[PDB]
Amino acid sequence: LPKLVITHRVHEEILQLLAPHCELITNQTDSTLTREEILRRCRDAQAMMAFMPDRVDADFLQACPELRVIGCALKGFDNFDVDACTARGVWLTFVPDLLTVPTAELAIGLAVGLGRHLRAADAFVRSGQFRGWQPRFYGTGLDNATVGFLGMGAIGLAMADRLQGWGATLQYHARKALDTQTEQRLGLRQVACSELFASSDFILLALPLNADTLHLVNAELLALVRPGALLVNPCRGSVVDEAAVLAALERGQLGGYAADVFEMEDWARADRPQQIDPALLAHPNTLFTPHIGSAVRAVRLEIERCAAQNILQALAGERPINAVN
Amino acid sequence: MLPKLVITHRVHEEILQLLAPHCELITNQTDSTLTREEILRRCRDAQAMMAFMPDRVDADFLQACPELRVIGCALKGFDNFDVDACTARGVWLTFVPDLLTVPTAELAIGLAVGLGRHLRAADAFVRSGQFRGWQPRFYGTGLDNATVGFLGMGAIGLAMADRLQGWGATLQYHARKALDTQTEQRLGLRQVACSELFASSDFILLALPLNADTLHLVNAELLALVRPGALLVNPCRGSVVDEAAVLAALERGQLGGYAADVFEMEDWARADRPQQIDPALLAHPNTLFTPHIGSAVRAVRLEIERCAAQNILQALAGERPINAVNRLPKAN
Numbered sequence: 014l015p016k017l018v019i020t021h022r023v024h025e026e027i028l029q030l031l032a033p034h035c036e037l038i039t040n041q042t043d044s045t046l047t048r049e050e051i052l053r054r055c056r057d058a059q060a061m062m063a064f065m066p067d068r069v070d071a072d073f074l075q076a077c078p079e080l081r082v083i084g085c086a087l088k089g090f091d092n093f094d095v096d097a098c099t100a101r102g103v104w105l106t107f108v109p110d111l112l113t114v115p116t117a118e119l120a121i122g123l124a125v126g127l128g129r130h131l132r133a134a135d136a137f138v139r140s141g142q143f144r145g146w147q148p149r150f151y152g153t154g155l156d157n158a159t160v161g162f163l164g165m166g167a168i169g170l171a172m173a174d175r176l177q178g179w180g181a182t183l184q185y186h187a188r189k190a191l192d193t194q195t196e197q198r199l200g201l202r203q204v205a206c207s208e209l210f211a212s213s214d215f216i217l218l219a220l221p222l223n224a225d226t227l228h229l230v231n232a233e234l235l236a237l238v239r240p241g242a243l244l245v246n247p248c249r250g251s252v253v254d255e256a257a258v259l260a261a262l263e264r265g266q267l268g269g270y271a272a273d274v275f276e277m278e279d280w281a282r283a284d285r286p287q288q289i290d291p292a293l294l295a296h297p298n299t300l301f302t303p304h305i306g307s308a309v310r311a312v313r314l315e316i317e318r319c320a321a322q323n324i325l326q327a328l329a330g331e332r333p334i335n336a337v338n
Numbered sequence: 339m340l341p342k343l344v345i346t347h348r349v350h351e352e353i354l355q356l357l358a359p360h361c362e363l364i365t366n367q368t369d370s371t372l373t374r375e376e377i378l379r380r381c382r383d384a385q386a387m388m389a390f391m392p393d394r395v396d397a398d399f400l401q402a403c404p405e406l407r408v409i410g411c412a413l414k415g416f417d418n419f420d421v422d423a424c425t426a427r428g429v430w431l432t433f434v435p436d437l438l439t440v441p442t443a444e445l446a447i448g449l450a451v452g453l454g455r456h457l458r459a460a461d462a463f464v465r466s467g468q469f470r471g472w473q474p475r476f477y478g479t480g481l482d483n484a485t486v487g488f489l490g491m492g493a494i495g496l497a498m499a500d501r502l503q504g505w506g507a508t509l510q511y512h513a514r515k516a517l518d519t520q521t522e523q524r525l526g527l528r529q530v531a532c533s534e535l536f537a538s539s540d541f542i543l544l545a546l547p548l549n550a551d552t553l554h555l556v557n558a559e560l561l562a563l564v565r566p567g568a569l570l571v572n573p574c575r576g577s578v579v580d581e582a583a584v585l586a587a588l589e590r591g592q593l594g595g596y597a598a599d600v601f602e603m604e605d606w607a608r609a610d611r612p613q614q615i616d617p618a619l620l621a622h623p624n625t626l627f628t629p630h631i632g633s634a635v636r637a638v639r640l641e642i643e644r645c646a647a648q649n650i651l652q653a654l655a656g657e658r659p660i661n662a663v664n665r666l667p668k669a670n
């Protein structure tokens with residue numbers, strides 16, 4: 014039986030699916046294992062199921078000469094040397110875009126949770142202090158607010174779709190303009206970047222991490238915001254300068270920051286932060302999630318099934334449906 | 339001689355200015371709620387009252403305030419105000435029919451997402467300093483492809499259905515009256531029986547007033563019907579659900595979760611009301627709570643106060659208040 018290494022915990026159904034066809038070396042824990050431990054497991058493996066924290070470069074592959082396929086439970090290229098894969102005759106597969114929708118859902122949850130002070134609200138009830146309706150605990154809603162999107166691709170559109178009927182005025186800035194018919198359907202108006210930060214009550218980020226988008230949301234752009242403005246980051250940590258965000262919060266100019274992603278997980282950068290600043294983590298005007306954008310059971314199960322089906326295709330000798338090479 | 343107006347809770351300065359020409363104001367410009375005893379004392383010789391969520395007006399209250407012409411409520415659900423007793427005393431009762439709807443609807447949906455996505459525990463984890471990167475954790479329930487069931491389909495029910503239009507869910511509802519076909523078609527709403535709603539829904543969103551028919555409607559029997567993992571969200575009134583039965587359903591792991599902006603302990607018109615939220619519910623991990631902040635948006639509260647102020651002025655000027663709940667004799 015061909016050997017398969019699964020680097021992270023999967024649903025038992027996935028183990029049940031693969032076991033008849035593969036000898037399984039599994040990691041049914043919550044932990045990410047060391048690169049050394051992964052290399053050890055994969056040395057004589059014919060297949061790998063890889064997840065977001067996995068990094069595949071030329072060196073990794075050379076140390077796994079029997080590898081025929083890496084089935085990824087993901088969609089991004091950044092961690093995987095596609096050209097080195099083909100060069101060593103290894104199939105690299107990704108999943109179709111099942112991640113955008115749950116992320117967009119979470120982003121809007123984060124906007125409402127941040128605007129309505131949900132962390133502090135829930136803490137107040139849980140503590141036993143609630144004795145009835147009180148005239149305070151004020152927040153900001155979406156109705157009549159201006160929502161600005163920085164970027165307008167897959168998640169930008171998914172979020173704009175889900176804000177239809179919320180009574181907001183939608184605006185965006187993107188490197189590529191939307192076609193006129195989409196703009197009119199969604200009620201989106203294109204604005205300049207400086208204008209987006211100057212005039213938005215909510216700023217929802219919807220852009221990728223590039224050399225040119227690194228720290229795009231910096232002290233200069235944040236200095237433009239309306240006092241009390243809310244910033245939501247479901248994209249990548251490093252499109253934002255987290256130091257500058259924290260300073261804008263402590264100044265009281267930025268009203269809140271919600272994030273699913275953090276500068277510290279963007280490993281390619283030499284002087285990336287090693288953690289999230291404890292003072293950011295302690296700030297009251299925040300709401301955080303541990304990169305759970307696609308953390309919907311049905312979605313995660315389907316992603317894993319896709320990866321698993323792609324691995325079985327490659328092992329049976331055929332070209333996998335979601336082969337990227 | 340200006341009519342005396344008792345205002346039980348703090349109001350914006352701009353509302354105090356609109357009323358001051360026509361009324362002597364007996365105010366409570368603190369953050370606190372006064373006792374029953376204190377409110378009765380201030381209203382003894384009052385012509386008007388602006389009441390808020392903590393207020394309760396029964397026959398006994400009105401008997402001790404015989405000069406009252408109007409009670410203007412800054413709320414929509416007037417379950418704690420005895421309408422018939424007001425009418426018997428020739429007192430107008432007014433409410434606010436629409437202004438609370440939208441921020442409450444926004445909140446209800448934010449609660450649904452927060453509850454389904456394990457936001458409380460997820461945030462706590464990041465704040466602990468222990469985040470290292472993606473983990474196969476916090477897998478939850480999203481709206482895409484879910485069955486969303488509404489119990490009640492009035493202003494808040496409709497505002498929520500509106501806000502879910504691009505979310506890829508299957509929307510169904512139970513109400514006392516069906517929506518017309520055209521509205522159902524436009525919003526993708528399918529009418530179902532109550533037990534059907536409870537048996538089939540991934541999310542159950544309550545949008546019902548508190549009355550004798552809805553009192554403990556969401557009871558043990560209905561909760562025994564839910565698909566294991568089902569999420570229940572209550573933005574309306576605490577006592578529409580039996581909190582004891584809800585906790586029990588969470589503890590056996592059948593109900594996947596309960597989110598609530600409102601609590602049984604607030605429903606004063608009940609003789610047997612719980613005096614607190616059960617510490618075991620408050621401590622349960624599969625929850626998400628907010629302290630009756632449905633309409634707590636400054637710009638909205640100002641308009642709510644204004645509506646109530648305007649109704650009170652209309653009554654005091656001798657006309658029929660536009661948002662009167664009851665009807666008094668008027669010269670034709």
Ligand SMILES: NC(=O)c1ccc[n+]([C@@H]2O[C@H](COP(=O)([O-])OP(=O)(O)OC[C@H]3O[C@@H](n4cnc5c(N)ncnc54)[C@H](O)[C@@H]3O)[C@@H](O)[C@H]2O)c1
Pocket residue numbers: 089112113116163164165166167168169186187188189219220221222225226229247248249273274304305306307
């Ligand atoms: N948190 C999560 O779980 C999660 C889930 C899905 C995607 N994401 C992340 O979200 C990001 C965006 O994803 P997507 O699929 O929408 O990307 P996309 O490529 O579909 O769209 C990107 C958009 O950003 C715009 N853009 C690029 N550079 C810009 C710039 N300098 N200024 C303004 N706009 C610019 C583009 O024109 C485009 O409109 C990705 O980096 C992805 O990794 C995160």
Ligand SMILES: NC(=O)c1ccc[n+]([C@@H]2O[C@H](COP(=O)([O-])OP(=O)(O)OC[C@H]3O[C@@H](n4cnc5c(N)ncnc54)[C@H](O)[C@@H]3O)[C@@H](O)[C@H]2O)c1
Pocket residue numbers: 414415416435438439442489490491492493494495512513514515545546547548551552573574575599600630631632633
């Ligand atoms: N959390 C908050 O701050 C907040 C804000 C506004 C309203 N509320 C509460 O929410 C309630 C609903 O508000 P609304 O504006 O939608 O009220 P509404 O009167 O506009 O609509 C209530 C709906 O429930 C239906 N209904 C009544 N009894 C029913 C039953 N037994 N079975 C099925 N359906 C029934 C009615 O047919 C009506 O469609 C209010 O009465 C109030 O108690 C809370």
